[PDB]
Amino acid sequence: GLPTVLTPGSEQFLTTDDRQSPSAMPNYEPTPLIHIPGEVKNLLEIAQVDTLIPLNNTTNTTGLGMYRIPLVQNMQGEQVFGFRLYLGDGVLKTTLLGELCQYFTHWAGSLRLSFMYTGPALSSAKLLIAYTPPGAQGPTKRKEAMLGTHVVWDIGLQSTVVLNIPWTSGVQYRYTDPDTYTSAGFVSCWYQTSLVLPPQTQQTVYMLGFISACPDFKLRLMKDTQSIHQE
Amino acid sequence: YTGPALSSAKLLIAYTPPGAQGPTKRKEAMLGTHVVWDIGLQSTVVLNIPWTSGVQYRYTDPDTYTSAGFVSCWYQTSLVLPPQTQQTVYMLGFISACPDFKLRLMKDTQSIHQE
Amino acid sequence: QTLASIKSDSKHTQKVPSLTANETGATLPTTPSDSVETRTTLMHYTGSETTLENFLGRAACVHVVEIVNKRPTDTEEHRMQLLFNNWKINLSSLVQLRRKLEMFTYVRFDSEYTIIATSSQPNEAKFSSNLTIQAMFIPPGAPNPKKWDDYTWQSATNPSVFFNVGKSARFSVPYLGIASAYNCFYDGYSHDNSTTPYGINVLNHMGSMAFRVVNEHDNHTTHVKVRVYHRAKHIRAWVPRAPRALEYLHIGRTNYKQSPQNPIKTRKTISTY
Amino acid sequence: INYYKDAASSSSAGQSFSMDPSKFTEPVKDIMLKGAPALN
Amino acid sequence: GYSDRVEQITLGNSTITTQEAANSIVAYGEWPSFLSDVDASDVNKTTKPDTSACRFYTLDSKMWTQGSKGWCWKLPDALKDMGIFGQNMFFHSQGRTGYTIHVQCNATKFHSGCLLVVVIPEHQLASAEGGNVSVLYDKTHPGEKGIDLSEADSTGPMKDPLYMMDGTLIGNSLIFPHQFINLRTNNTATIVVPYINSVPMDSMTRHNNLSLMVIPIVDITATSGTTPSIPVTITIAPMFLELSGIRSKAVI
Amino acid sequence: GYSDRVEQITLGNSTITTQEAANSIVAYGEWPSFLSDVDASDVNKTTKPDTSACRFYTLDSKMWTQGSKGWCWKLPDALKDMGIFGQNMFFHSQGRTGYTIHVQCNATKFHSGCLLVVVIPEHQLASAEGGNVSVLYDKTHPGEKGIDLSEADSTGPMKDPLYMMDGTLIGNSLIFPHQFINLRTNNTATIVVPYINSVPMDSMTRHNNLSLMVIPIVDITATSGTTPSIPVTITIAPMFLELSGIRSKAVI
């Protein structure tokens, strides 16, 4: 009989532990695995897939209206949209990326936004998409927005613009959950020129917002989400 | 020494090993380990207090048995200030471990409390 | 081994190691051999005891909570009545540890926790009960239980620990950042606003640890105190600083009493031995 | 000797280091205890 | 030959010349330098203003008289109005820099007294009110004015220099990079400090890195005459200024 | 580099540090050393107390004021009460030693005046009474007190410093190992003296070897103020102390 010593933690149940254990079904032979399309190895593979942003989550907006960003006629220098950038909250709370990230405490790495213009082929516009790093409020004017990271989008033949939002942080990781200290700043869009529709045409046109992780996107520590409850 | 550049003094810095009391007189102090400090151009004197012990370790906490003796300073000559000058001047004392300094066994301090 | 001292005989020279200038900020090393004649002798010492690792590597009580086994009362939240008790993690609570950590500006380590539960029955209980205690780690942004038996306790993604009263749990937690080192102090704000809170509380987002008595209500109230101990591992620290002299008032603050007691004891005269 | 894979689970090894007090005692640019005057 | 007490510091388009100085200090034995490619987490190409910012700026001098308690400045805050450096602090999300700090205090051979100049990283201040009261932004960001420990302020930080506004005795503050100005010998202190943080780069406005304190350990005095009054001048320069994340000027 | 005016003397467990000194003197160009096997006539194995005796001892300081005539100490007598050295003088029949002698006298740049420090071997003193009167033991062996040339004593030695208590003019005393303390420059004198005798070893009590005299050639004075008074401190150490002939403590 080998002398042994027990240590603190003996017989504890730790839900994150990994140990070997006896099989309840000795010599069992599992059903052979066949090729099934769509195998997933990492959640980060999923995080890189674009999903829609319910950006127009305004009061009294219903149905699919939340995923439609209105653009209209003769607006110049006006704000199209804007939101404080949160990963596990705000307008991104219910996105795929958002929900995946709600399972993690910390997040680092760049994000991508993209916008699809769905208006008439004969229409045109130029939009400014801008990102304002932490340490400032707003922007409230295009003149402020242009001082951040931005792209001017020529809504022409190609319908989609991609804005890569860089990891503008002095902190290696930010919190997924809302946090003043590690806040990610703001995202906004302004009319660079204006929406122009064919003569005598008056209507609202829309664009769709999308979000995905960049290849450099990182998630650090798993946790439960706040997006589900049970009685 | 932080007094006037025009001032001067000589101080005796002395260490008295365990097994004696005082010193009460300079004549006693001079019999221990000492240095005479010429307070001139360089402002700082360093006195290395040797491990004058028959015991390999002393207690950090007050202890008669392992007491470390006494430190004292005497006016070797006197403080001399420029003519017609009358004032107190000061010096600052510093302490540090020598390269041979050793600490042997960790314990809680008595310098903090909590309710 | 190395020498503590090297034999040195009487000197009469131009080199004077005994004179310097502390104004430089230097603390140039000197030895007894610079002031007195000396015998050659060995250190017989490695300094192992004084390593940072050994200093901050001893377990210390961090926090104590109390939870009970009691029939829920309709009029009180399960936090008002201690059926469940969520500790916000902060090593500053029990100040002996706090000082040892505050001695450095930046500290990095992995943590090891030990959790010990003890029950008591101050009432007319007819028998003891070795209650099962659950601890759940709740990272920032994770759901905070509302009820002792809430869905949150499923711990689908939250690390959790189960142990019995009289037993203990032990586990390691890797350095949680988010920075490259933990800050002991923070001379700043969460953001640029006059009314924003000042100090390390800004950065202390380690989440919280929820405790629960797993067992259903018995026929009497049982009180369980859970003591959490912490030990650092693989410890690195930067920029040492002077230890606090005055009594601490509140967690995360360097505040002290408006009329503090001078830490320095006095004597009748500078000449008193 | 290691039973777990996370580094955090390892024991508090175990590697001593030499001392380097010069960071705190001799940060002063270009000096040495030569017995030479500190300021000249 | 050369003497340690005589030195010239050239930085950008500015110089400092000293004749009575103590050897300068390079805090923790390390020079200021730029962020490496293995430290950085910021994907944005950084800006290096060099000369335009990395030059000496002088803060309004303060008078040292008997009874003075000492003064404290915060960095980078103290330089927030200093030309380009100042402006860069508000146009960038984050930045990184070391400093060269010079404390100057002239006197004659008939004067005595001694200042302690200490640079304290992350000097989290105690509120004057004690209790659980925090210190307001306005009182931790005085800019050039600094904090005069001689001036009462019921909403400010603790002022009594015995404790360096944090419950820690001044006697042990010498653990921090420091230098004395002993009017007997040197009349200036010089300290070079590398960027120190847990984060590669950080906000230049919501957070200070260094706290520069100058405390009259020994009161100023003359051999004769009335209470002396000697100005104390502080000159500070960014060493390796690296900036990132350009955006609309911060408003605070 | 180094300057001649700055020096450290380490001896036994004691040190002396000077910043304003003249180059020390080694009398007659020879260092103190131990008796060789071709000098000795004493068959008794000698004792070499080393550190226990060969350390600096300080004699009670005397004040230098205008009108002071100077002072004289006899060696080894002056050290007869100095701890171990002292005791060894009485427990041994004979002994041998050289000395290091330090005369210290601090002053400011507003002071002037000059001491002459002379070590005179076999300084046979003239009696105050002149004639054929000898000087009594008691007056040649004052110990630490020394002989104050300013103090009248009808039974003591001649006191007028013009002649160094022996009918020989002071002007020519510079033939002996000597050094000046010119308050203008140095503030201390250092003289190292080898054992000097016709006999390898000798009594430590019936005979002195050296006579240390300190004479204010130029009276102490200040540029302004009242008559100055500056202490003169003398510190002396045995160099190579060699003893022989242990016996019951001498009683005198």
From TrEMBL, chain A:
Transmembrane segments: none
Protein location: Host cytoplasmic vesicle membrane; Host nucleus; Virion
Family from the record: Belongs to the picornaviruses polyprotein family.
Function: Protein 3AB: Localizes the viral replication complex to the surface of membranous vesicles. Together with protein 3CD binds the Cis-Active RNA Element (CRE) which is involved in RNA synthesis initiation. Acts as a cofactor to stimulate the activity of 3D polymerase, maybe through a nucleid acid chaperone activity.
Quaternary organization: Homodimer. Interacts with host GBF1. Interacts (via GOLD domain) with host ACBD3 (via GOLD domain); this interaction allows the formation of a viral protein 3A/ACBD3 heterotetramer with a 2:2 stoichiometry, which will stimulate the recruitment of host PI4KB in order to synthesize PI4P at the viral RNA replication sites.
Protein name: Genome polyprotein
Provenance organism: rhinovirus B5
Residues represented out of the complete protein: 330 to 560 of 2177
From TrEMBL, chain C:
Entry keyword Coiled coil: no
An individual GO BP term: symbiont entry into host cell
GO cellular component: host cell; viral capsid
Locations listed in the record: Host cell; Virion
Record has Nucleus as a keyword: no
Keywords assigned: Capsid protein, Host-virus interaction, Viral attachment to host cell, Virion, Virus entry into host cell
One function term, GO molecular function aspect: structural molecule activity
Start and end residues of each Picornavirus capsid domain: 33-203
Protein name: Genome polyprotein
Automatic annotation (TrEMBL), chain D:
Protein name as annotated: VP4
Gene Ontology molecular functions: structural molecule activity
Transmembrane spans: none
Domain of life: Viruses
Cellular component per GO, a single term: viral capsid
Functional note: Forms an icosahedral capsid of pseudo T=3 symmetry with capsid proteins VP2 and VP3. The capsid is 300 Angstroms in diameter, composed of 60 copies of each capsid protein and enclosing the viral positive strand RNA genome.
Organism per entry: rhinovirus B5
Entire protein: shown range: 30 to 69 of 69
